[PDB]
Amino acid sequence: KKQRLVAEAEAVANGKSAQDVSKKPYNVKYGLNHVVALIEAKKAKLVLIASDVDPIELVVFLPALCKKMGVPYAIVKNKARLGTVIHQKTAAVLAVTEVREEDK
């Protein structure tokens, strides 16, 4: 992020549009509240819920919320594994909203 942020700075200093310098990000959406909002807005196409969240109530409602909005959801082991994906230690849930046409 720092190198990309700096590169945008010299681009603006050079007099270039900030939109066209950087491409649209395509990344996993993480964080419990952010993923919950995506499910309620039907923007998440896949939800991965950690099986060992403590307290459990943080994700007990999530399968029902995913089912009502028709979001495909799987319960995956190791919140630690989800953390490694998103560069953190532990992650309660992971949500995939957009992927490239190669991986569609």
């Binding site: 942020l5 700096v6 945008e8 700075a9 603006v12 200093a13 900030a18 939109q19 950087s22």
Partner: peptide, 14 residues
């Protein structure tokens, strides 16, 4: 584009 990132690239440029 991100306006907060716009402030941050301006900060880094400064």
């Amino acid at each position: 584009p991100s306006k907060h990132e716009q402030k941050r690239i301006l900060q880094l440029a400064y």
